[PDB]
Amino acid sequence: GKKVLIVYAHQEPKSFNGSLKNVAVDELSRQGCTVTVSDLYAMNFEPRATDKDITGTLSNPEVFNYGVETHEAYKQRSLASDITDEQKKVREADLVIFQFPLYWFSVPAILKGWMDRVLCQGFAFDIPGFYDSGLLQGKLALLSVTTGGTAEMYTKTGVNGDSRYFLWPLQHGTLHFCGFKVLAPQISFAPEIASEEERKGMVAAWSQRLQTIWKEEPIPCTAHWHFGQ
């Protein structure tokens, strides 16, 4: 038995990102997996890291330090319920899939805020705390990204550089850091410019990949993988 959380960041259900999220739900459900979706825009998920994230009273209210405050609130069971609700989904999951369009070589801010606020010290990491000592080892993570640019723009000598270059802060600096084994990314290059036939091709690569996702090994989430040889 396998549990999957899909963290989904697109405003429009009729989008290509929506299609990809829905075929994931459909295929993983068909397999018998337990599936949960965090539809961040529908949730009006809060992105900002603020003192509202700790309930009651602070470890030092004279000088607010978000990292220390949330670390202490996680230990005293004092985080805001939107955070802890996401933490439970994560804790239960065997696989976390992030489904998003590439905004400025990264995640949309609403999803950045989910990372910033959900992946707190004590839960995902400790200081010291991290990479293999992070707290989500044993779990799989996978970034399913759509891009505005064509594949060849994301080549080494392409204007955008290699797609791997922009994955670093997300796969390594965030997911690896917290202990996830990182599955190879799903990159759906320039679906908006693509034909209905290229778009169906991309959706089926993904449904077909999902059929065998539990047979994948994580990538080696190394600087050599992103930047070499």
Identified binder of a second copy from the candidate list 112, 150, 184, 214, rule CB under 8 A = 112
Q: Which of residues 58-97 bind a second copy (CB under 8 A)?
A: 62-67
- Residue 56 corresponds to which tokens in the numbers above? 């009651």
Q: Which of 216, 214, 207 is nearest to 21 (CA)?
A: 207
Stretch that binds a second copy, among 12-20, 85-93, 137-145, 203-211 (CB under 8 A): 12-20
SS in 3 state form for 112-140? HHHHHHHCCECCCECCCCCHHHCCCCCCE
Toward a second copy, which CB reaches closer, 78 or 147? 147
- Residue 165 corresponds to which tokens in the numbers above? 């270059």
Which residue bears the tokens 């459909």?
26
155 labelled binding-site residue: no
19 labelled binding-site residue: yes
Stretch that binds Zn ion, among 21-29, 104-112, 186-194, 221-229 (CB under 5 A): 221-229
Assess contact for 210 and 95: CB atoms under 8 A: no
**Which one of a second copy, Zn ion, none is in contact with 108 (Cβ closer than 5 to 8 A by kind)?**
a second copy
14 binds a second copy (CB under 8 A): yes
Whether cis (ω within 30° of 0) applies to the bond prior to 229 is: yes
226 labelled binding-site residue: no
**Which one of Zn ion, a second copy, none is in contact with 65 (Cβ closer than 5 to 8 A by kind)?**
a second copy
Q: Which of 76, 90, 77 is nearest to 118 (CA)?
A: 90
Assess contact for 115 and 174: CB atoms under 8 A: yes
Assess contact for 69 and 59: CB atoms under 8 A: yes
130 labelled binding-site residue: no
Toward a second copy, which CB reaches closer, 93 or 178? 178
172 binds Zn ion (CB under 5 A): yes
122 Ramachandran zone, left/alpha/beta (phi>0; psi -120 to 50): left
Number of Cβ atoms within 10 Å of the Cβ of 102: 21
Q: Radius of gyration over alpha carbons of the chain, in Å?
A: 18
103 labelled binding-site residue: yes
Q: 5: which strand partners?
A: 36, 96
32 labelled binding-site residue: no
Stretch that binds Zn ion, among 84-92, 137-145, 185-193, 217-225 (CB under 5 A): 217-225
222 labelled binding-site residue: no
Going by the annotation, the residues of the binding site are 10, 16-19, 102-105, 125-127, 146-149, 154, 172, 176, 192, 199, 221
Q: Which residues bind a second copy (CB under 8 A)?
A: 11-12, 14-15, 41, 44, 47-51, 62-67, 103-110, 112-113, 115-117, 119, 127, 130-131, 148, 156-157, 159-161, 165-166, 168-170, 172-174, 177, 192, 223, 226-227
